[PDB]
């Protein structure tokens, strides 16, 4: 039907002078029952967008999806995101985790990962997921296929899913003692996860009052303006942008290629988030932000947007600094913030020959 394409073209033709206003309006409707929390509501869109599969000729096939994990103190909104993201996507199977047996996480009969082909399998309560079962998913998380020869049958099945998980920080959380210590998960497992966003509750006297007024006054959607969006429209949007096939560029790759080389050895290179599986994710994330904005050519803007988010993802050790996810609000104007971010990033990792061109493009726009 041409009506849907016409309406979406009108929407992303009106917002031509300001390109980031459209993305802000897109993000505002994701889980509109919560207040603020910018980065958390931004990472879910990238995770839900997806990627592109690239299979070699003879035998091999690399992954083309993404995964996410959230850790935070009780009472922050983790379950709301899972429940809301289990509805927008066409096919989803919501599990309990510790309440789910081995018959679901693997093959038996079809379980959960196999039953969620081309979908998204929400998983909750990942802290004590039956260690045998919690480790029998390494093969199904990185190769997108199962390989079992139980009872001498030799059966092979396909399973391509995006996994969302949320686990409590068992033991009082500490700013130091990186998640490998606080959560006590093996290094092999804590490497396939793309973004590990940490949620921490602190001492403030303004967010408390704002959220108290929000809950007490029952003000649904404090932005009383009637823009919003219905769930059907968002479902159509996230089922229609999954057909475009973006291609890389030259003002693009170089930034990520230099960032990885710089990050590989600064002084600590953390302990597990500096492997080759970093450059295989810094591309699958940058190729999703070019599908959320109705185009098929990755440019400097997408690279900067993904680099900032990914650098903020790594808690503690970083190369600019860490910002808490909870205490964030939508900026009043995104254009100036993007202009400042580009100038900040393109200086210390040297590609100043591109800063002048980007400024020339921005001025003439």
């Amino acid at each position: 039907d041409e009506e849907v394409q016409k309406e979406f073209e009108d929407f992303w033709e009106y917002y031509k002078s300001d390109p980031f206003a459209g993305r802000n309006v897109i993000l505002a409707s994701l889980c509109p029952q919560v207040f603020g929390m910018y980065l958390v509501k931004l990472a879910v869109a990238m995770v839900l967008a997806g990627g592109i599969q690239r299979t070699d000729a003879t035998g091999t096939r690399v992954r083309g999806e993404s995964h996410l994990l959230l850790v935070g103190d009780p009472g922050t909104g983790k379950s709301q995101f899972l429940k809301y993201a289990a509805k927008i996507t066409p096919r989803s199977v919501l599990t309990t985790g510790i309440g789910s047996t081995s018959a679901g996480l693997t093959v038996t009969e079809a379980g959960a990962l196999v039953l969620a082909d081309a979908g998204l399998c929400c998983i909750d309560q990942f802290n004590s997921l039956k260690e045998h079962d919690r480790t029998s998913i390494h093969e199904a998380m990185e190769q997108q296929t199962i390989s079992v020869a139980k009872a001498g049958l030799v059966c092979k099945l396909n399973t391509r899913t995006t996994i969302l998980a949320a686990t409590n920080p068992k033991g009082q959380y500490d700013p130091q003692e990186s998640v490998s210590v606080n959560i006590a998960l093996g290094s092999p497992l804590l490497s396939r996860f793309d973004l590990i966003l940490v949620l921490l509750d602190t001492k403030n006297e303004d967010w408390d009052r704002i959220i108290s007024s929000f809950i007490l006054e029952n003000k649904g959607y404090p932005s009383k303006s009637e823009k919003l969006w219905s769930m059907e429209k968002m479902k159509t949007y996230f089922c229609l942008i999954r057909n475009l096939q973006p291609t890389l560029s030259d003002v693009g790759n170089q930034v990520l290629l230099r960032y990885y080389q710089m990050q590989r050895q600064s002084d600590c290179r953390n302990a597990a988030r500096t492997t080759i599986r970093l450059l295989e994710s810094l591309i699958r994330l940058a190729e999703a932000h070019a599908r959320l904005m109705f185009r098929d050519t990755v440019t400097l803007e997408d690279a900067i947007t993904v680099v900032s988010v990914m650098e903020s993802s790594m808690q503690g050790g970083a190369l600019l600094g860490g910002v808490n996810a909870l205490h964030t609000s939508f900026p009043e104007n995104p254009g100036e913030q993007y202009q400042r971010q580009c100038e900040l990033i393109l200086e210390k990792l040297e590609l100043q020959s591109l800063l002048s061109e980007e400024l020339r493009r921005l001025e003439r726009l």
Partner: protein
């Protein structure tokens, strides 16, 4: 459907002067004392309201409380619950030794049969493996299939009321609260009120209690409910009290008023700023929702649709019996 005489009886009961005393002192008349503990069960029997805000997506929030009672043995914390289960449109009583994970949950579990009612569980402490099996049912307000989680969900609306004993039999008075209960910070925050009862050898209380038990076999919100001897407080029969909750639960939906919300906001902002430095159970945003859910409850007992300042002044005194008032 209710008969005409049923409506006449309900209207007559509504006309009583002190409608809170005649309900908080008639749930179980054998037990002497424990006014606030019985008031908690009286509030929990009615419940609150269900919010379907943002009907495009909703993601509904539960509208019923959860009460846990922990104290020394011999106090009588097993007959306040029998009467509570008996006086209910639909109830069920299950022990904590003969039931497993497949018992409480679907395999039709105890929770499913307690739909729109009470599923009071005794001997909560003895459970050691089924603790992590009801955190989903209590919060999500729904339960899925227990066979590899292949969809097939079914509603499960319960108002779990549990009673348990400390780990060391008698609870001694020089330790920390967290190690005398053997509970994590996840299962100790879902419950709305966690009463702690002690057994101390007073003089007047024992002299009255012994007289009461020998006779049987032959202002703050703690004194206005007490009965001064020399008057008649003749209780409503449980048969008539069972046909009042049903009318109250499907013909009135309370809502908050602008005057009441200010007190709750002030109390929340006072609790947080003080207990964020001291050591106690962390106050999440759940308590602000809990105060609303309980203040709505004290508007379905008197058969009204409002929340006056006086009504919101009662979930402030009953709340300071498991929080700050008791943490010391």
């Amino acid at each position: 459907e209710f008969s005409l005489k049923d409506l006449y009886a309900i209207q007559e009961i509504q006309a009583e002067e002190n409608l809170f005393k005649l309900i908080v002192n008639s749930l179980c008349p054998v037990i002497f004392g424990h006014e606030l503990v019985k008031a908690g069960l009286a509030l929990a029997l009615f419940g609150g309201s269900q919010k379907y805000a943002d009907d495009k997506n909703r993601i509904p929030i539960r509208g019923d409380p959860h009460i846990l009672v922990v104290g020394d043995p011999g106090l009588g914390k097993s007959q306040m619950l029998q009467a509570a289960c008996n006086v209910a449109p639909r109830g069920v009583y299950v022990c904590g030794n003969t039931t497993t994970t497949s018992g409480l949950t679907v395999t039709a579990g105890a929770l499913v049969l307690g739909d729109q009612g009470i599923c009071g569980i005794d001997q909560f402490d003895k459970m050691g493996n089924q603790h992590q099996a009801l955190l989903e049912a209590m919060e999500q307000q729904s339960i899925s299939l227990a066979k590899a989680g292949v969809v097939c969900s079914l509603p499960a609306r319960t108002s779990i009321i549990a009673a348990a004993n400390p780990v060391g039999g008698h609870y001694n008075k020089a330790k920390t609260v967290s190690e005398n209960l053997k509970m994590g910070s996840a299962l100790l925050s879902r419950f709305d009120l966690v009463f702690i009862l002690l057994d101390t050898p007073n003089e007047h209380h024992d002299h009255l209690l012994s007289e009461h038990v020998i006779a049987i076999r032959a202002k703050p919100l703690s004194e206005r409910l007490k009965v001064v001897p020399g008057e008649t407080i003749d209780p409503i029969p449980h048969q008539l009290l069972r046909k009042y909750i049903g009318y109250a639960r499907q013909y009135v939906y309370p809502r908050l008023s602008t005057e009441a919300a200010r007190v709750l906001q002030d109390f929340y902002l006072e609790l947080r700023k003080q207990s964020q430095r001291l050591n106690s159970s962390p106050i999440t945003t759940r308590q602000l929702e809990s105060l609303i859910r309980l203040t709505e409850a004290r508007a379905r007992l008197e058969l009204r649709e409002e929340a006056t300042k006086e009504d919101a002044e009662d979930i402030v005194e009953i709340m300071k019996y498991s929080m700050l008032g008791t943490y010391s």
